[PDB]
Amino acid sequence: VDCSEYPKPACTXDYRPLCGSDNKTYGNKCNFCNAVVESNGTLTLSHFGKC
């Protein structure tokens, strides 16, 4: 989880899915990292690809 450059005000609409510890499939690293910050450290990366 290298989200050091977050959060970011917007994310591009490529699709490179990541499966979060919340069992949500995030569209790409940008969407996943912004969610990690908003979660106050509770969200982590389960695995690459869709859940």
DSSP string, 1-51: ---TT---S--------EEETTS-EESSHHHHHHHHHHTTT---EEEES--
CATH code for the domain of 1? 3.30.60.30
Give resolution, Å, one decimal: 1.6
What is the extent of the structural domain holding 39? 1-51
Provide the residue type at 4 as one letter.
S
> In terms of C-beta distances under 8 Å and separation of at least 24 residues, what long-range contacts does 19-25 make, across chains too?
19/45, 19/46, 19/47, 19/48, 19/49, 19/50, 19/51, 20/44, 20/45, 20/46, 20/51, 21/45, 21/46, 23/51, 24/51, 25/50, 25/51
Number of domains in the chain: 1
